[PDB]
Design a protein around this ligand. Structure first.
Ligand SMILES: NC(=O)c1ccc[n+]([C@@H]2O[C@H](COP(=O)([O-])OP(=O)(O)OC[C@H]3O[C@@H](n4cnc5c(N)ncnc54)[C@H](OP(=O)(O)O)[C@@H]3O)[C@@H](O)[C@H]2O)c1
Ligand SMILES: Nc1nc(=O)c2nc(CNc3ccc(C(=O)N[C@@H](CCC(=O)O)C(=O)O)cc3)cnc2[nH]1
Ligand SMILES: [Mn+2]
Ligand SMILES: [Mn+2]
Ligand SMILES: [Mn+2]
Length: 159
């Protein structure tokens, strides 16, 4: 099973200038809980944005060019990325935009955080047909002293 996890601001913005400009600790905690002990697939730009291996997870990086760090696994195509995960119950795809586009048709589940923030960005989450997806979990949170925007965690499953 392939799942995508992402945090989206208004208008499906996911990034700007290879960064995420907001800071929502509660959402990073949700990201860690849902990815720990699973393989994570990311594109090269997202690898450079994170800047280090994510502990407790098999880190698989898509790039057309040879890898430059043996702490992670480098692959050259979608099919190779999936194969490098082995026989696990759930593969997590952690972006970015180009990678989400390629894995969306293959995904059975989306873990989405909707953030009530207006962000200029240059990267968007793919348009997804709403009729294909059933919302199985949602949880709304108001802003607090640690999280400066309201946010909604949602899990969707392909019908
Ligand atoms: N809000 C969120 O949830 C979230 C999550 C993740 C990322 N982001 C943001 O998203 C942005 C990065 O997204 P992005 O769309 O620019 O880049 P990306 O999807 O992270 O990476 C694209 C790169 O991945 C490689 N790639 C992708 N598909 C491939 C394939 N089929 N075969 C081989 N290599 C492949 C290529 O690397 P080469 O050029 O080396 O071939 C390509 O240039 C940043 O702003 C980041 O902060 C946000
Ligand atoms: N919901 C969601 N939020 C995100 O921030 C997110 N980020 C990415 C890609 N970028 C990043 C950037 C930083 C870390 C990070 O530092 N993670 C730590 C945080 C643990 C914690 O804060 O409790 C980790 O161990 O996962 C992960 C992914 C992909 N999907 C996402 N999905
Ligand atoms: Mn092939
Ligand atoms: Mn197998
Ligand atoms: Mn806001």
């Amino acid at each position: 099973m392939i799942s995508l996890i992402a945090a989206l601001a208004v208008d499906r913005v996911i990034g700007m200038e290879n960064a995420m400009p907001w800071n929502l600790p509660a959402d990073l905690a949700w990201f860690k809980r849902n990815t720990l002990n699973k393989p994570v697939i990311m594109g090269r730009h997202t690898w450079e944005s994170i800047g280090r291996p994510l502990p407790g997870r098999k880190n698989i990086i898509l790039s057309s060019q040879p890898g430059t760090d043996d702490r992670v696994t480098w692959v050259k195509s979608v099919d190779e990325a999936i194969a490098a995960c082995g026989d696990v119950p759930e593969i997590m795809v952690i972006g970015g935009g180009r990678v989400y586009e390629q894995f969306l048709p293959k995904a059975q589940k989306l873990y989405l955080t909707h953030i009530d923030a207006e962000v200029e960005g240059d990267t968007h989450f793919p348009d997804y047909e709403p009729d294909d997806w059933e919302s199985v979990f949602s949880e709304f949170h108001d802003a607090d002293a640690q999280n400066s925007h309201s946010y909604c965690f949602e899990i969707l499953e392909r019908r």
